[PDB]
């Protein structure tokens, strides 16, 4: 893309998107999950490009040229993200995560605090502790013999029986270059994240400074999942959610206009005070 840069972050050379838009705050920080990169956000960036500064960091070993790197977790993702923001001179930002990029977002809210990071948006992030099928998927990702079997089972869950051309292209072309080094790590880090923090809902409730957070999601589609979101929102005045009714796990790809309007609402709320 026209906006892709590379910088040295501590020991590692990381790629990142920066449209270097000169405009009012806040900056929109789009956080990828595990074993994909800024390509997941190409449609969402087009929705936001004109009106906001947009930054998308890629994690260690992530990007157009994936590589083997030493083991790292979401704490390093957070430091890598802040170091890129410091280099760029960004003060105030609205972070937006996909799936297990949420662990990075919630820890980023904690470390950055509510003046720099007054709100956050989490997209399609499993709010409950792993149910058997997802727990099984993580087990296979960590298996050096069965990791691709793991990825195939997740792609099935993510597409949810849809022939969704753009999402299939992301999973089968834009993620094809990621290996056991990434997918194995993703299994290990996510399993440890739930084990250590209990759940995304526990981790958000545990913030020193609670702030406005919206969960926007298309799946899981079952009423039981909507109910845990409604029960959390009813108990926590700062928490909201919207079911986007997109076909796949990837609303940034399949309903980028819908994601964008939630992000614009939060950016507008920050600008008013
Ligand atoms: C791209 C992406 C989405 C996910 O939900 C996920 C789940 C487990 C491991 C890695 C992952 N990576």
Numbering used by the authors: 3 to 275
Report text from the authors:
Arthrobacter nitroguajacolicus Rü61a 1-H-3-hydroxy-4-oxoquinaldine 2,4-dioxygenase (HOD) and Pseudomonas putida 33/1 1-H-3-hydroxy-4-oxoquinoline 2,4-dioxygenase (QDO) were the first dioxygenases discovered to belong to the ABH-fold family. They catalyze the O2-dependent breakdown of N-heteroaromatic quinolone-type substrates with concomitant carbon monoxide production. Atypical for oxygenases, these enzymes promote the activation of the triplet ground-state O2 molecule without the aid of metal centers or external organic co-factors. Kinetic measurements indicate that their reaction mechanism relies on a fast initial step, during which the substrates' 3-hydroxyl group is deprotonated by the His-Asp subset of the triad, thus promoting its activation for molecular oxygen attack (step 1), whilst the nucleophile is not essential.
The HODS101A variant was also considered interesting as the AqdC ABH-fold dioxygenase that catalyzes a chemical reaction identical to HOD naturally possesses an alanine instead of a serine at the nucleophilic elbow (hydrophobic elbow). MQO binds to HODS101A as observed with HODH251A. Although the S101A replacement causes the loss of the H-bond between S101(OG) and MQO(O4) this is compensated by the interaction with H251(NE2) resulting in an essentially identical binding mode. Under normoxic conditions, electron density at the R-site of HODS101A is consistent with the presence of a water molecule. Next to the R-site, a water molecule (W3) is also present at a H-bond distance from O1 (2.7 Å) stabilized by the side chain of H100 that is flipped compared to the HODH251A variant. W3 and H100 flipping are also seen under normoxic conditions in two of the four molecules present in the a.u. In HOD, S101A replacement, however, has a negative impact on the KM value of its organic substrate (60-fold increase compared to that of wild-type HOD) whilst kcat is not affected.
